[PDB]
Amino acid sequence: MSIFIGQLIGFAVIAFIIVKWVVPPVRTLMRNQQEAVRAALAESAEAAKK
Amino acid sequence: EAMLAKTAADNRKSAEQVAAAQADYEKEMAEARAQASALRDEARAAGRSVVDEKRAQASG
């Protein structure tokens, strides 16, 4: 039980680290990719219109 | 990938069509101007022939 508490709050620390330092960069990468594909799509539509 | 290639091709096609509109406009207008000039020149030549023939007839 004691080791369960220790590992549980260690995993809490790990999750804190992931959300603090790892989630922001991956979210930024996903945002960049989504914006790039949305661009490509809009550019294709505007090229067809042109 | 095909959409990107088509976008590039369509941008190139749009540019070349905006150029070809002017190109064909100029070509057709040059043709019409040439037709007008040829008509005027042949009219002048026909009038010259008319006056020369009438000169010969009057002399006779």
Side-chain angles (χ1 to χ4, degrees), chain A residues 2-18:
Chain A
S2 42
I3 70 190
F4 173 87
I5 267 50
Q7 65 105 41
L8 177 136
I9 77 93
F11 163 87
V13 169
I14 295 200
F16 177 92
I17 288 163
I18 297 331

Side-chain angles (χ1 to χ4, degrees), chain A residues 40-41 43-48 50, chain B residues 3-4 6-8 10-11 14-15:
Chain A
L41 175 62
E43 245 297 282
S44 167
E46 303 338 312
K50 202 192 292 236
Chain B
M3 142 172 296
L4 255 69
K6 175 156 66 275
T7 300
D10 287 333
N11 266 330
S14 308

